[PDB]
Amino acid sequence: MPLPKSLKYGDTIGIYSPSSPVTYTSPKRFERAKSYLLQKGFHILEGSLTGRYDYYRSGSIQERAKELNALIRNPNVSCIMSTIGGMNSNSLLPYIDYDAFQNNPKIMIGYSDATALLLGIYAKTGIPTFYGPALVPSFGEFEPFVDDTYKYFLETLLHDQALPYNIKQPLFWSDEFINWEEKTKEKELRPNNWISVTNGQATGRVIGGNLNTIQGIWGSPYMPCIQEGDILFIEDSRKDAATIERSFSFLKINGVFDKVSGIILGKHEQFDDCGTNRKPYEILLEVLQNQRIPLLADFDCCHTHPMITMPIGVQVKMDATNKTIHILEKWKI
Amino acid sequence: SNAMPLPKSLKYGDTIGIYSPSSPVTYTSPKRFERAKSYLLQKGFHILEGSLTGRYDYYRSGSIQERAKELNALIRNPNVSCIMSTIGGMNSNSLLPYIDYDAFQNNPKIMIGYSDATALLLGIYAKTGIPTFYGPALVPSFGEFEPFVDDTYKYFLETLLHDQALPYNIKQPLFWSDEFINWEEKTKEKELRPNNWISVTNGQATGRVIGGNLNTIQGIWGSPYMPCIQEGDILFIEDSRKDAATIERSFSFLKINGVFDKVSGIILGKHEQFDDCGTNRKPYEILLEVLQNQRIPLLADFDCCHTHPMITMPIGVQVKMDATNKTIHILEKWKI
Numbered sequence: 001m002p003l004p005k006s007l008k009y010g011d012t013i014g015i016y017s018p019s020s021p022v023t024y025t026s027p028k029r030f031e032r033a034k035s036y037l038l039q040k041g042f043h044i045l046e047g048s049l050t051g052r053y054d055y056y057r058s059g060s061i062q063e064r065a066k067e068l069n070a071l072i073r074n075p076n077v078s079c080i081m082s083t084i085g086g087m088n089s090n091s092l093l094p095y096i097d098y099d100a101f102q103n104n105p106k107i108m109i110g111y112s113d114a115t116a117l118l119l120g121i122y123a124k125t126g127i128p129t130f131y132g133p134a135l136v137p138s139f140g141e142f143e144p145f146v147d148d149t150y151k152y153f154l155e156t157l158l159h160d161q162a163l164p165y166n167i168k169q170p171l172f173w174s175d176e177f178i179n180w181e182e183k184t185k186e187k188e189l190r191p192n193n194w195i196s197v198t199n200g201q202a203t204g205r206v207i208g209g210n211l212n213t214i215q216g217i218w219g220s221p222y223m224p225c226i227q228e229g230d231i232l233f234i235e236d237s238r239k240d241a242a243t244i245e246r247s248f249s250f251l252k253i254n255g256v257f258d259k260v261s262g263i264i265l266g267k268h269e270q271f272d273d274c275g276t277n278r279k280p281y282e283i284l285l286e287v288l289q290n291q292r293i294p295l296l297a298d299f300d301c302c303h304t305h306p307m308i309t310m311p312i313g314v315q316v317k318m319d320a321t322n323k324t325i326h327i328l329e330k331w332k333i
Numbered sequence: 334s335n336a337m338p339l340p341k342s343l344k345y346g347d348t349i350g351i352y353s354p355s356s357p358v359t360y361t362s363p364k365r366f367e368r369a370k371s372y373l374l375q376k377g378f379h380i381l382e383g384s385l386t387g388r389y390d391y392y393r394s395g396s397i398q399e400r401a402k403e404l405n406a407l408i409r410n411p412n413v414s415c416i417m418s419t420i421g422g423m424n425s426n427s428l429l430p431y432i433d434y435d436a437f438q439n440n441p442k443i444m445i446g447y448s449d450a451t452a453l454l455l456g457i458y459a460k461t462g463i464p465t466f467y468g469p470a471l472v473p474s475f476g477e478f479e480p481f482v483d484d485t486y487k488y489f490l491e492t493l494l495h496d497q498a499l500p501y502n503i504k505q506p507l508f509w510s511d512e513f514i515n516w517e518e519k520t521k522e523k524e525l526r527p528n529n530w531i532s533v534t535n536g537q538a539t540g541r542v543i544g545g546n547l548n549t550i551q552g553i554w555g556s557p558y559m560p561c562i563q564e565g566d567i568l569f570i571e572d573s574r575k576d577a578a579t580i581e582r583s584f585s586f587l588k589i590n591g592v593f594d595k596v597s598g599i600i601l602g603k604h605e606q607f608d609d610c611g612t613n614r615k616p617y618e619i620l621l622e623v624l625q626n627q628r629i630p631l632l633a634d635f636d637c638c639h640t641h642p643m644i645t646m647p648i649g650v651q652v653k654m655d656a657t658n659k660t661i662h663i664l665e666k667w668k669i
């Protein structure tokens with residue numbers, strides 16, 4: 001299993017916009033995010049669609065594929081990071097140069113709609129990819145939370161790590177919908193807990209990402225096949241109960257819960273419970289119908305702040321009862 | 334092909350069973366519900382109300398198990414000739430593991446509805462091989478005020494009741510509307526908009542029609558409940574009240590699954606209240622960008638979707654589409 005080199009200070013991070021044109025619509029947060037990473041000691045190479053606008057997207061299918069492929073093919077770029085998600089990353093998949101990526105593995109990181117690319121590249125090349133910060137939402141965040149996200153980013157991509165690698169829970173989180181371009185108040189600190197929904201333990205390859213986005217690639221050559229023993233990692237954001245029930249049942253009818261040994265469920269940013277007062281894991285519990293699968297919920301690798309950086313495609317032990325997550329397998333050189 | 338099991342044609346005086354696999358419309362829109370019921374009763378049909386009728390569980394009619402129980406009671410009832418959803422929603426795919434496919438296979442009925450009910454229409458077809466129907470749901474379709482309800486009814490009768498010599502020509506409606514108004518109570522006449530279908534890409538295709546609401550298909554794809562698309566199939570798709578970003582994602586989902594390498598033609602419904610995100614693009618223009626250099630005959634703005642009036646389309650039978658001349662003919666029996 002071929003691995004990317006670790007990030008180093010002085011490296012260049014290439015950025016691209018596979019879907020929403022955030023570098024046009026949110027210039028202040030974009031500039032703040034660039035400045036944050038420049039100050040830490042990284043260089044930013046702006047992809048060819050930076051600053052461009054095509055309404056709901058940055059550009060045509062062909063132009064977005066060209067933007068990403070230029071970064072993949074550039075030997076001076078060690079990390080490729082989405083600016084933000086959207087809906088439209090899956091349009092790029094037939095056009096990506098997977099051979100160039102496989103010949104010179106790099107860190108590929110982002111979240112939400114970029115799940116289509118993270119999973120497509122892993123499915124095509126076998127190289128682990130990373131569910132973690134996207135430049136504008138993640139590194140344009142104001143203090144305090146941006147500094148916690150950054151610590152997790154260094155831990156996974158830069159620091160030497162000995163195995164197993166314990167992924168530690170943050171003390172505080174927020175999903176507050178505020179302080180996007182300009183800071184008004186402090187976000188409330190929410191004390192953190194992971195939730196032992198269904199006790200138990202599971203060990204196996206972690207596969208997943210943004211669940212809504214997975215339904216845009218399922219069945220294709222870009223979705224890695226779920227195998228007996230895998231651990232399912234899933235998150236969604238700003239949906240309602242009706243939407244996530246449909247997504248949970250989509251997994252159920254596909255036999256996913258017959259295969260996986262365990263489930264890790266992210267927090268759900270600004271969940272709309274439709275008046276039911278049910279939490280997302282409770283809707284998942286209904287769909288599971290008392291099948292006993294260890295389930296650990298409110299994991300901080302999702303749309304809430306701060307964000308953990310998780311390797312996808314490597315062995316993990318999750319312990320739902322004790323609320324721990326360990327990476328058992330090397331993800332980088 | 335060889336003769337196959339088919340549901341019996343609808344007859345005057347038959348009983349239509351109704352069920353709510355997702356949104357609790359019989360609770361939330363009682364005026365339109367009672368009007369739709371009264372419309373079908375006036376034609377001489379009977380209405381058998383499913384067990385969740387008038388019930389409320391927020392976004393849904395009831396629990397996964399309650400909803401399956403409701404539908405199964407209709408499937409198992411020998412006196413019901415047609416099983417019709419009250420409305421869609423998001424949550425019909427939850428029911429799929431629990432449906433008694435054996436009972437449906439033992440006593441086939443006309444299964445009809447649209448939107449989210451696509452999960453069940455395709456699931457039953459996939460499990461049993463019995464054609465199902467993309468067509469009226471009780472509340473939106475038959476609760477519609479005149480004039481449009483009368484056109485929807487004419488197509489429903491022509492397809493499900495009247496005997497039809499094959500090939501069966503599906504006529505273009507003369508008028509349509511997507512106006513979001515007159516739901517519970519009528520405040521104005523809807524505009525009668527002159528209607529056309531659109532020849533997007535010229536050509537002809539003949540094959541088995543498969544499809545439905547495309548957004549709902551992404552909730553069953555890959556499962557035993559989604560019929561496998563075969564070489565030569567005609568893909569029929571519609572969506573409603575989405576934006577350009579959502580439909581580009583759905584069209585690219587079909588592309589990366591190799592669907593456009595298999596199908597011989599595509600029929601695209603009108604898109605009720607489409608949000609173009611400021612692009613001024615039509616849904617078929619976004620689909621054509623996804624198709625890139627691949628030429629496929631394509632007929633768009635077909636009236637089997639969320640706009641009024643609504644055509645009833647059998648699914649799982651051979652069809653001939655002519656995109657150049659804008660015609661659709663059904664080539665194989667769907668009822669006996």
Ligand SMILES: Nc1ncnc2c1ncn2[C@@H]1O[C@H](COP(=O)(O)O)[C@@H](O)[C@H]1O
Nearest residue numbers: 084085086112113137177178180237303
């Ligand atoms: N106007 C805004 N105000 C607050 N948060 C925003 C705004 N626009 C985008 N976001 C955040 O950016 C994230 C990006 O989401 P995604 O589109 O899934 O990549 C959202 O989930 C929100 O947390």
Ligand SMILES: Nc1ncnc2c1ncn2[C@@H]1O[C@H](COP(=O)(O)O)[C@@H](O)[C@H]1O
Nearest residue numbers: 420421422448449473513514516573639
């Ligand atoms: N309040 C309303 N006003 C007008 N039309 C509605 C209203 N609620 C539902 N509808 C119609 O009912 C349809 C239900 O679609 P679905 O949820 O997809 O089965 C919508 O797409 C609209 O055409």
